[PDB]
Amino acid sequence: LVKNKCVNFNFNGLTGTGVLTESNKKFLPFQQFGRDIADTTDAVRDPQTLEILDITPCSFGGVSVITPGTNTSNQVAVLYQDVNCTEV
């Protein structure tokens, strides 16, 4: 088990991708999953050990291109919207 990275996981048939951070959500005395408003498996309990891993989807993002008219010059400035680009 490796965390804090965008990983393709498989928890007893639970298939998906994201970051599996370590979160203290709640007790989960006998429940395994963690749900939300949608059909989202927000939290998962490990099959081997017993810990509450929190699933967060990988970063989205749209790309926009600042550019003057191509008559003037050819340099451009890329903008990745809603991306905390400490990681490109």
């Binding site: 989205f60 749209g62 919207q81 809603d82």
Partner: peptide
């Protein structure tokens, strides 16, 4: 302001004019 009180391919763009400019 006081009286006035997701990850599946949808985003919310921020307005061009922040409340300070307004």
């Amino acid at each position: 302001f006081n009286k006035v009180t997701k990850f599946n391919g949808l985003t919310v763009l921020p307005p061009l004019l922040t409340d300070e400019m307004i």
